[PDB]
């Protein structure tokens, strides 16, 4: 079910995964047309929609430095750690929201980015270079 | 068409007295007054 933009904010993470393109398509293009030339009021909203694309490109750089690159669902090779949210499957995807999920991960979220940027492409690329000659 | 989409099962904590939209609208109204009165007729010689 669609339910439009952010419709599954309180639904399960599994049901919320069914609407990734919906949340993705409405964040980048909130296009205001600034054809009228008004002096001091344009710089504020221009800075706003420029910092918007700066944050978007920061997220895209983070999603490119990883083995994942497709702006979609993707799998990695970094194992999940039992210290992070000691929960089984179906307990997460059927009785939890992405908000509470990021809240519980926020304690251990900072090292996961490092494990994804270094334990992967800093070694996966090097293995790709030393295993593509044969 | 105003895209008004109700989010079911969503309860969100609002606080109107710490909101920042009010500050934005206040500064915008102030700059509106200032930029509306800038190119008009000044009356400094009227102080007689």
């Amino acid at each position, epitope marked *: 079910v669609f339910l439009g933009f952010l419709g599954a904010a309180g*639904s*399960t993470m*599994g*049901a919320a995964s069914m609407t990734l393109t919906v949340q993705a398509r409405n964040l980048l293009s909130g296009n205001p047309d600034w054809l009228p030339d008004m002096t001091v009021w344009g710089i504020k909203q221009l800075q706003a929609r420029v910092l918007a694309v700066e944050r978007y490109l920061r997220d895209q750089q983070l999603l490119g430095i990883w083995g994942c690159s497709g702006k979609l669902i993707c799998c990695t090779n970094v194992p999940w750690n039992s210290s992070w949210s000691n929960r089984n499957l*179906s307990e997460i995807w*059927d*009785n939890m929201t992405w908000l*509470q999920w990021d809240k519980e991960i926020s304690n251990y979220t900072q090292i996961i980015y490092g494990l994804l940027e270094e334990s992967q492409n800093q070694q996966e690329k090097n293995e790709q270079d030393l295993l593509a000659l044969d | 068409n105003p895209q008004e989409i109700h989010l079911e*099962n969503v*309860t*969100e*904590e609002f606080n109107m007295w710490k909101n920042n939209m009010v500050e934005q609208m206040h500064t915008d109204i102030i700059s509106l007054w200032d930029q509306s009165l800038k190119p008009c007729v000044k009356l400094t010689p009227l102080c007689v």
Partner: nanobody
Amino acid sequence: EGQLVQSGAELKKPGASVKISCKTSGYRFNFYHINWIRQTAGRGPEWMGWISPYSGDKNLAPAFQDRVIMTTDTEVPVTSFTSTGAAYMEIRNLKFDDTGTYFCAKGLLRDGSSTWLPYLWGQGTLLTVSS
């Protein structure tokens, strides 16, 4: 952190009726089904029925289709994740076989094959049908 509280102990006569409350706290009342199951020494435990505070969908046992009526109020949100609802149950045509401890409990999951399964149980409420 859902800490549910049921009603108090009451005494009734056969053929009369009695109403048992089921006040909740610490969790979203509309996010889970509310089960109701009894425990009588004459036939052991028997699942009485569940109800959905969100969609308003109830489901009883065919033996309790006529005498059990389960109602729910609307949840009172305390925080963005906490609400204090209430689930009442009225039982009529009291007989000698309906003497025991009754329970209401919280549903398991919000989606899947076992969504309504009782996880968090109340402390219980004992009823004695006697003249």
